[PDB]
Design a binder for these strands. Sequence first.
RNA 1: UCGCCCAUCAC
RNA 2: UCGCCCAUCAC
Lengths: 366, 122, 121, 227, 227
Amino acid sequence: FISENVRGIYAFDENGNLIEKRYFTDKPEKVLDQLLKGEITKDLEELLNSLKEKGYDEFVFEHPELSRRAKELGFSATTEFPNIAGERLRSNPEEFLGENWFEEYYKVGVALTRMRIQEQSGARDKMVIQAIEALDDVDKVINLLVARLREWYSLHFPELDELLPKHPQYVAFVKTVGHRDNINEEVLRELGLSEEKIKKILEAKEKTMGAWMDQTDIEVVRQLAEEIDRLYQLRKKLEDYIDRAMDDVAPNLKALVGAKLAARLISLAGGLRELAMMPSSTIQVLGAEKALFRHLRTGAKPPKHGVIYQYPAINRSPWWQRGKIARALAGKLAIAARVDYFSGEYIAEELKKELEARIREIKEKY
Amino acid sequence: ARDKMVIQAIEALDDVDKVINLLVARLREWYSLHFPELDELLPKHPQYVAFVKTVGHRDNINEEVLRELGLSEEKIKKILEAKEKTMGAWMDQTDIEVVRQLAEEIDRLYQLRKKLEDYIDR
Amino acid sequence: KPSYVKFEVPKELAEKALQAVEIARDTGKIRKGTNETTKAVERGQAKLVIIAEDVDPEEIVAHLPPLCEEKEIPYIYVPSKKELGAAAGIEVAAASVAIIEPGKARDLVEEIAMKVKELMK
Amino acid sequence: MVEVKKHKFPGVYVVIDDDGSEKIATKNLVPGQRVYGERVIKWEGEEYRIWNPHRSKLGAAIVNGLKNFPIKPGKSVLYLGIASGTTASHVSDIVGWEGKIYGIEFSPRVLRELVPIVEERRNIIPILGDATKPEEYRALVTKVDVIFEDVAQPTQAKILIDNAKAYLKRGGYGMIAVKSRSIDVTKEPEQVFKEVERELSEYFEVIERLNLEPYEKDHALFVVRKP
Amino acid sequence: MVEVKKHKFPGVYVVIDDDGSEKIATKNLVPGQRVYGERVIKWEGEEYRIWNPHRSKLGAAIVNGLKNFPIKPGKSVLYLGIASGTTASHVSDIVGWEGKIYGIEFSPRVLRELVPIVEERRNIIPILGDATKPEEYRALVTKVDVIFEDVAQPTQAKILIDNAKAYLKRGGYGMIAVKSRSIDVTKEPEQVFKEVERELSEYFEVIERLNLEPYEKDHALFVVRKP
RNA sequence: UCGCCCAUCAC
RNA sequence: UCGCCCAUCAC
């Protein structure tokens, strides 16, 4: 009964006669991917109305879910792919696409192929399981190498293992300073101690019961600790990816920007509840904590953009607008987190239409 | 304490080889989702690590990069034969770089292994 | 139909909450718009918070009720965001407003807080 | 030293190598382009490119016993499993500028490496989709003279049948490359090829069946006609 | 959106981007490795890395307008005042595998950090010793096309001159970053720059002189040639 | 009170 | 969120 091409939508009788035709007026690759996947577009919604208004009823379509949307629109519809409408349409391209028909199929086919650059995949559960046991293994190599680092540094400062139970802090000290005798309060404040802890280490500054690690022995201990930072970065690459391999049931916060950004936004908030409570004028700078620190201590230059930086609208837009984009982009993300926590409906393509409306202005104003 | 520092470097050398073996067992199993024919075909562990570090995705495999990695013309008569027929699944570009980063941090650990051997030699 | 209006109100108090902004405007300390409202609730600075009934999408203001309840702050609703913005001294709209020091309105904010507390039952 | 000659099939060529040995080839549709990382040479005014039987799998069937070669210049063809153009670049060379090639692939990064090549090879159209879901390209192609399939999936005999309902003309031809270990890897491959033998003969007339050893492993090819 | 372009100097590159202003860049001698946390672009068969001008004066001088730059592909050079070698990483890229680079440092511990980086950047040799005393490294250096000085100690005119007695070839070039305030703090910088010009012009010819304003203050770059 | 080279972390 | 100084005490 009905079939479609790159230029429009066509209805035919059971002897192959045309009934009516309509043409596309938006960028057609979008309109095609809907109709190819059984979703209804406005020119088809008007065409089937025009057929009921002209008194036609034997509605057979090519795709099963198009017959499903048609009977949801009320119309008594069936499915068969080799039907006379698809046969007329695909046999006589010059009636429906003109003289240069293969160039028009080419022009839109490559555009449709460029929007079909997929996410969601049928094997990502196997990748979650390997990322989970890889986090379990990498957290275990870090515990082994930090235990070796503790037993080795106990030849220079044996009280230090009995004083610092936290594992990243014990590596950050050796990356930054490593020499026991170059310690003072200021380099213990940034290291993330508490005041009741900072008098220890210093109480033992000369009088620790450990020996002497050479300026050439602390070198191999430092090269060992420097590799544990690259392994903490691998642990963080996996701790970002564990959500990135689950999110193929896509939230609005994912679909507005990209998966590693949604995972890090929740990772820096501590939860989706917290992110759905934060304002745009905090989500703008979320994660910029080593910039917040230096600004709070001085009243100097403020933090410009947080975790949202690694997205194309900021990391490829002029620095003059890398602040101006960040406030409103954090606003549409602040709404996306509230939709995902309270509402549960999917609106990401409208949040994208709305975010591109403010970005379009920022490309005409400047 | 120079000999006690050498003793901790010797315990570190067995502990480093032991965690390289652990992360290589995960690297074999995870990359076998995307190229399962490779596991029996590259038995030498650092040669499997450096392969995954520089290749990442399975279509970056060429005669040139395998001969730079120093494989034999025999070993290169396979691998390429298997790439045209593999029974493995599909990891995306966004996924397979995580398995490439796992191989890169194991080549960091193999460089630390030499820094321990060269420290003791001084 | 907004979902954040967690109690129905009589024909009273709401125009009195708008009046409590109009007399605080030039006499007190106010924060206007939902992101500065969220800062004023988060920093425990608000003494009353006000939300409009005509906000669309609702998922910009939808977080305010549980966020201000978990901080023991009085809350109320008013009919429209353009009128709420105009009372809060600005020429645009505001989806919500917070009063931080009510100035002249201190005794009226205490009337609103104590009478809202008797209908949250 | 190299030389070039015609084959027995239209648009197919033979190259002579620096010992004197014969190997199969095609005339390049866009001179100067390399299309799958292959061996390419110049002759009398024109450029010619190798058909590798291991990489462009149809070439192994041409060497081992293929008689039924249905394609010509100026014809219309559907290709399922076009990948990065390895096999289908040779049908693009043969079918010419008056002829039409539709190329379907599911694997987005694999088709992505063909998109720049068909920015010059404009007789191929690149189409993203699973050939097991042919309705998802119903509006993007005409009817055709020929179908080829190279997706090598567990139910691929049905993929050929239902694409031959939707797209193949009366008396038109079908061709299919079959990878046993996609369908089964526990049984003898001649039993897998016997299940393909009984499904193709439930909708077509069958006219060729082959083996691709030693160029491939666990692999066959068939040729059929629609009624 | 970004574009990589050649600069007006052999081996030196430029990038333009999403703000569209020029930034100075180099084609990486060892693709994939980082040195200081640089900005980078991977490209068509290549990798390019940026030099931030606020990190070393020689970058700022090339942005300001320094025209007589002698460090070029395949040349031999000796440099004093390298520390951990961010400067040396970008001249390693510009000179490539064809040339030869020596780097001398007097601060003993800050040179240590360059020692593993030169296991990849094997066109650099790091050397510990007093830049004022050429005799202290005489066995591990050779004649060069260029000398560069940016220790900029109070002795720096003797650092340049005596290394240019020992190592600079006839017709060869020199560069010096004149730290006015460390040679004499008792007089206006133009008097310090005039004695550096009148001492250097009793051994070299001067080809160009640059004050680093309006980017930085009271420091200058001089470039010269030995007959 | 100031200068330069230089790592690392960040905007 | 981070820093300094006087008096007194110790190796």
